[PDB]
Design a protein around this ligand. Sequence first.
Ligand SMILES: [Mg+2]
Ligand SMILES: [Mg+2]
Ligand SMILES: [Mg+2]
Lengths: 254, 249
Amino acid sequence: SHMAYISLNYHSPTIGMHQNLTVILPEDQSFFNSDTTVKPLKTLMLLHGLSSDETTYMRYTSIERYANEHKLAVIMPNVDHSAYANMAYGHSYYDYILEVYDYVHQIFPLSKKRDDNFIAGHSMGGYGTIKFALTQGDKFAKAVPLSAVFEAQNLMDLEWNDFSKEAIIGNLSSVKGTEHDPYYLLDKAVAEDKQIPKLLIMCGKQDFLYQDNLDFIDYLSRINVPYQFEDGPGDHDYAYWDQAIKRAITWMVN
Amino acid sequence: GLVPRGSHMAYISLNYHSPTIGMHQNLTVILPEDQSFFNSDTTVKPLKTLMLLHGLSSDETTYMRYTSIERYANEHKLAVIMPNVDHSAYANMAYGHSYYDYILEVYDYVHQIFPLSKKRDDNFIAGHSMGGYGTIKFALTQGDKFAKAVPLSAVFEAQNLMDLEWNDFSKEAEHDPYYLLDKAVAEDKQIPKLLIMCGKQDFLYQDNLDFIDYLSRINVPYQFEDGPGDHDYAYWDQAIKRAITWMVN
Ligand SMILES: [Mg+2]
Ligand SMILES: [Mg+2]
Ligand SMILES: [Mg+2]
């Protein structure tokens, strides 16, 4: 089992500026044989939080080692703070992550089947994960929010830069009951009979978001949305996300 | 889903384990951002592709740093593949007789995993110094794979291999362009269109004049472009600009 480690710098049409991506691509024998078709890989979209970039999971966890064991391609895009609340509709975080998805599935040998595509992330990346699970449920078979932001008030506790923080403060009164509120997205997804990915939700018991995580899964239980929840000792850091992403990858592929 | 306006390149660094040499190797790939790559509802448009071979004083980043090749390739919507063929890697490939195998492996791998045209008319090869020697060898033994070949300031023997502080054991431890040329002409093999370049102050200028004289006598067509320049990236920057324009037109 071998992996190709890829760094990609490209101009993003959605954001309108350059963005970096990390891609780890398992080596498959079909990729070296010019006479056979490529065998498409299972693929995880992995979303970092506000103190990270496209290199942090590589540096602060052993994710590549876990992915190599399970022959899992992983896509780690850079996410700028301004993507979440400073951009116009159509040019925001949501659109950008879907652009990354489309681009890497066009240019790399990644499966396009729902059963072969997963999404995961922590903190604001866990907010991203649950938003994509509830709006792009036909795209991802499984979703793993880690130490996730589920509530509007959580947003004021985070490490936003100055320009993004000003947009967060200025639009806070507009989050609840909109497409930016995970609870609203959840209620809507059920109503439109949308596919919801299988959910594995994880949080450490010392995390400042732990109780809001319990509140979210309690609501899931009350509206009969299936999920698995795993907790244990751990805080809001990569010592926990290293352990959690190892467990998540095993769960995803099996 | 939004698609690029105008011409942009993706800059890609790839590290992969090579089945051929059983070692990890770096590649640089510059890949045009074609609109089809951002539209999930269309088939990808395969791109014209250059395999570019650096010399023994370089690595897979040197062309990026010491020329403006990416700017030239962006203008002409050309994908460029720059494998590491550095001095230690080449020494291992030459000893194990795996150099052809490695470059062919790189070719096959990038055409499998990236949206690169597999048609001969869309595939080119180029390189300078020992990479020009390599370009000539691939032109004469793999003429069916490349429509065009551009040797820059080529050497015609692998003596530069010895220009490292090898120990005596390593020093002591069909690769002739002219033999390969005779063979290709005798057997009526396909030879790519040839653009041969060398600067007039290069120590290798006379060796290149000797080679094109032999191509004339043996009736192999070519274009030869020369001018002021020495054996350096000031020359290769200008030469690869010209080569890329020639390749894609
Ligand atoms: Mg973070
Ligand atoms: Mg965060
Ligand atoms: Mg050389």
